[PDB]
């Protein structure tokens, strides 16, 4: 195509909720480095971000790093269907949310520990597997 | 005086060329309109079963076969001509059918 | 030469010298080059070729094996493991993408650069494939010419796979540099420097 030569300004470390991104890659591959979001999930949000689909970290506008979590923290606000989510129709509140990197471990232990010890709403013979053979 | 159709689907190929000959024989001694005996692709049946009553031994199998041949003739004649001759061409193992389909 | 027309609109460029006695769509067979006296008999099948792909019937007597073309033989050897058994169409794409990259590397005839190359790589001497009856030794022996050409081509081929395994460069980039390395006596390519040391210990053992 052509030779575009920008003045570096590229961040080897990012800060999106304790996620430090080696941003010399495609931005849809940049978000996949966090947990809870993969290329089947991160595909549409950059298409929702309405940017170029080939950029690196050295050329991103500074509002967009706020924007990408803003669409993330408001998932159903900007036309995300029900079949595009992780956590769905919860046993505690029934609502539907998605998860970031450092909190997939949230709604994980407490939701298994009831099946581990309390003989919960369904977990009474699902009670030894992650306890005796897979603890 | 109606166009008819006869089928015969048997499994003794020697005993199907005598019948299909005398069908076209007595029709042509009365010289009706006809079209020749169209011979269809035959059908074979098969079942693989291994060759032991118990299970203890080496393994390869059988393969059984059964062959079905089928051919059919169309015809037109007055009904008095045909209703006698279809009752004198009987033979065991052989099936005969009459179809008068004139839609 | 007088491009006639039909009801089919036919392109001229398939008719210019192709209707003339030049046969292959970019090269010819006028260039006949003999280096060894062994290769005079069977390797240069003097017949035309256009695509280097036909259904040869040579595998039912061991000397009709000789009459297949050389270019057909090297494509056959490209089926190497359990991923390319039967991908002949992939192979001819590789080969017709290698003579182009030969002739642009400062030379004169892309079919020449392999027929001289196999003159070097037909091993003049040999070990024996025997132990000896306990004393695992190696005795005096020589090689038949029709056996000589067989292992000559094949050791050139197998070096290219690891030469193009897991590195950025492609197959056609390997086959370019390998054959011009094989064209001269350099012993810098793996296609050469494993047949040499075979012959050197064969100069010992005997």
């Amino acid at each position: 195509s052509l030779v575009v030569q920008e003045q570096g300004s590229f961040q080897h470390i990012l800060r999106l909720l304790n996620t430090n991104v080696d941003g010399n890659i495609k931005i849809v591959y940049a978000l996949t480095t966090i947990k809870g979001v993969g290329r089947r999930y991160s595909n549409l949000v950059c298409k929702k971000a309405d940017v170029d689909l080939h950029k690196r970290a050295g050329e991103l506008t500074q509002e967009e790093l706020e924007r990408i979590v803003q669409i993330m923290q408001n998932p159903t606000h900007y036309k995300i269907p029900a079949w595009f989510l992780n956590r769905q129709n919860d046993i505690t509140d029934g609502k539907d949310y998605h998860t970031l990197a450092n909190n997939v471990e949230s709604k994980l232990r407490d939701d298994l520990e009831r099946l581990k010890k309390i003989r919960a709403h369904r977990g009474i013979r699902h009670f030894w597997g992650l306890r005796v053979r897979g603890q | 005086i109606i166009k008819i159709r006869i089928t015969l689907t048997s499994t003794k190929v020697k005993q199907l060329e005598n019948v299909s000959s005398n069908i076209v024989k007595n029709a042509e001694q009365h010289n009706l309109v006809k079209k020749g005996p169209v011979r269809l692709p035959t059908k074979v049946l098969k079942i693989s079963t291994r060759k032991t009553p118990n299970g203890e031994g080496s393994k390869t199998w059988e393969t059984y076969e059964m062959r079905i041949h089928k051919r059919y003739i169309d015809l037109e004649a007055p009904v008095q001509i045909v209703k006698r001759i279809t009752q004198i061409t009987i033979e065991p193992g052989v099936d005969v059918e009459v179809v008068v389909a004139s839609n | 030469f007088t491009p006639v027309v039909l009801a089919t609109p036919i392109p001229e460029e398939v008719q210019q010298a192709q209707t003339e006695i030049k046969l292959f769509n970019k090269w010819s067979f006028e260039e006949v080059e003999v280096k060894d006296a062994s290769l005079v008999d069977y390797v240069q099948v003097r017949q035309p070729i256009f695509v280097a792909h036909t259904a040869g019937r040579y595998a039912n007597k061991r000397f009709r094996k000789a009459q297949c073309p050389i270019i057909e033989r090297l494509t056959n050897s490209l089926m190497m493991n359990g991923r390319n058994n039967g991908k002949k169409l992939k192979a001819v794409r590789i080969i017709k993408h290698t003579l182009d990259i030969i002739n642009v590397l400062t030379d004169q005839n892309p079919i020449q650069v392999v027929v001289d190359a196999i003159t070097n790589t037909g091993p003049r001497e040999d070990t024996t494939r025997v132990g000896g009856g306990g004393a695992a030794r190696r005795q005096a022996v020589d090689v038949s010419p029709l056996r000589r050409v067989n292992q000559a081509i094949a050791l050139l081929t197998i070096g290219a796979r690891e030469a193009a395994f897991r590195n950025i460069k492609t197959i056609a980039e390997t086959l370019a540099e390998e054959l011009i390395n094989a064209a001269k006596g350099s012993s810098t390519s793996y296609a050469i420097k494993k047949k040499d040391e075979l012959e050197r210990v064969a100069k010992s053992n005997r």
């Binding site: - | 499994t11 079963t49 009553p53 059988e62 059984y64 076969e65 059964m66 | -």
Partner: protein, 37 residues
């Protein structure tokens, strides 16, 4: 069904005949099956 010869399994459900295959090899003749190849 269990037909005869210590079998309720390996039945030949195909072609609508329903024979235990231990007791098919001895009955396949008179049905009109024969081996040829």
């Amino acid at each position: 069904q269990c037909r005869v010869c210590s079998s309720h399994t390996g039945l030949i459900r195909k072609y609508g005949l329903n024979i235990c295959r231990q007791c098919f090899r001895e009955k396949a003749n008179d049905i009109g099956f024969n081996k040829f190849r």
